[PDB]
Design a protein around this ligand. Structure first.
Ligand SMILES: Nc1ncnc2c1ncn2[C@@H]1O[C@H](COP(=O)(O)OP(=O)(O)OP(=O)(O)O)[C@@H](O)[C@H]1O
Ligand SMILES: O=C(NOC[C@@H](O)CO)c1ccc(F)c(F)c1Nc1ccc(I)cc1F
Ligand SMILES: [Mg+2]
Length: 280
C-alpha cells in the first residue's frame, strides 16, 4: 500500500519534538519516500502477542481523515518500542504555545473550541472513538493555522496497556469516582483545557495530588475570571464543566453555542498570531 513496511533504518532523526509521561517524539525524514513525519516511540514491556494486537488496532488510524485529526502514516514495533509515525505539526501543541504566549486570547481559543468540537464529532460519528486524553498537549498546531487532535484512543489494547503502566488532573469528577469513560468526559477535559489556556496556568488551587483528586470530585468546577472574558465564553466553558455528566452540554449543543457561532464568524489570523508568538 501507500508506504509499505515501515522500519527504523529508513528514518533519519532531524530533531526532538519533546517528551512526556512515557515517550519521546522526534521530527524524522522517512528517507525512501521523502516524507517528513513526527515519530513517537512508546516503551511497553509486553508479550509479543499483545504488542501485535496493538500495532494492528493502530491501523484503524489509516481510516482517520479529518482536517481536525493529525494524520497517520504507520505503526511498527522495533526493539521493545512501538513507533507511531504521524503528520508533523510545525507549531507543536497548545501546551508549548501557552508556555511562550503566557495566555492564549479568547478569540484564538474560539478557533480551538471549533476545531476540538469538530475533531471529536468526527471520531464519535465516523469511528466511534472517544478521545480519552483531551488536554492541551494533544491539541497540535501548524504554520498553516491548522489545529488538530492527536493521542486519542483508537486502540483498545493500548488503552489497557497504558492504564497499567495518567493525566488524572484532567479527568472529570465522575471518571475520577471510577465511572467508565464517556463522551461527556472528553467535554470536561475540553472545558478544562480552555480555562487553563485562557488563564495561563492549571486552573485549581495548588495542593498535593491525592488532595486534588478529591478536590475535583467534591468541589465546584473551575470558572473563568468574569472581568476579562465574554459572557458567552464563560457560559461555554461553564456548560463543559457541569459536574453532573447528565447535565453537561454535549457536542451537538456546543456546536451551536453563542460562543462557537460568534467565533466561526470571526476572522482571526491564527497562523500569523502563532508565527509571531513562537518565532516560526
Ligand atoms: N505530531 C506531532 N508534531 C509535532 N509535535 C508533536 C507531535 N506529537 C507530539 N509532539 C510533541 O511532543 C510532545 C510529546 O507528546 P507525548 O504524547 O510524547 O506527551 P504529552 O502529551 O506531551 O504528555 P503526556 O505523556 O504527559 O500525556 C508534545 O508536547 C508535543 O509538543
Ligand atoms: O500516544 C498516546 N498517548 O501518549 C501519552 C504518552 O504518555 C505516551 O506518549 C496514545 C494513547 C492511546 C492510543 F490509542 C493512541 F493511539 C495513542 N497514540 C496516538 C493516537 C493517535 C495519533 I494521529 C497518534 C498517536 F501517537
Ligand atoms: Mg501527547
Amino acid at each position: 500500500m501507500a508506504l509499505g513496511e515501515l522500519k527504523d533504518d529508513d528514518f533519519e532523526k532531524i530533531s526532538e519534538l519533546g517528551a512526556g509521561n512515557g515517550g519521546v517524539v522526534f521530527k524524522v525524514s522517512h528517507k525512501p519516500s521523502g516524507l517528513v513525519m513526527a515519530r513517537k516511540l512508546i516503551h511497553l514491556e509486553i508479550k509479543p502477542a499483545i504488542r501485535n494486537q496493538i500495532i494492528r488496532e493502530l491501523q484503524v488510524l489509516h481510516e482517520c481523515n479529518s482536517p481536525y485529526i493529525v494524520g497517520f502514516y504507520g505503526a511498527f514495533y522495533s526493539d521493545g518500542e512501538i513507533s507511531i509515525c504521524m503528520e508533523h505539526m510545525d507549531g507543536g501543541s497548545l501546551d508549548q504555545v501557552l508556555k511562550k504566549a503566557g495566555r492564549i486570547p479568547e478569540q484564538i481559543l474560539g478557533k480551538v473550541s471549533i476545531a476540538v468540537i469538530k475533531g471529536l464529532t468526527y471520531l464519535r460519528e465516523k469511528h466511534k472513538i472517544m478521545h480519552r486524553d483531551v488536554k492541551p498537549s494533544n491539541i497540535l498546531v501548524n504554520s498553516r493555522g491548522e489545529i488538530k487532535l492527536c493521542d486519542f484512543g483508537v486502540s483498545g489494547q493500548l488503552i489497557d496497556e497504558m492504564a497499567n503502566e495518567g493525566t488524572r488532573s484532567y479527568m472529570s469528577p465522575e471518571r475520577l469516582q471510577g465511572t467508565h469513560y464517556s463522551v461527556q468526559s472528553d467535554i470536561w477535559s475540553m472545558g478544562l483545557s480552555l480555562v487553563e489556556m485562557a488563564v495561563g496556568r492549571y486552573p485549581r488551587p495548588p495542593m498535593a495530588i491525592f488532595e486534588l483528586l478529591d478536590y475535583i470530585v467534591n468541589e465546584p468546577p473551575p470558572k473563568l475570571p468574569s472581568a476579562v472574558f465574554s459572557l458567552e465564553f464563560q457560559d461555554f466553558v461553564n456548560k463543559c464543566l457541569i459536574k453532573n455528566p447528565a447535565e453537561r452540554a454535549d457536542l451537538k449543543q456546543l456546536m451551536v453555542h453563542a460562543f462557537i457561532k460568534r467565533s466561526d464568524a470571526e476572522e482571526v489570523d491564527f497562523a500569523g498570531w502563532l508565527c509571531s508568538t513562537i518565532g516560526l
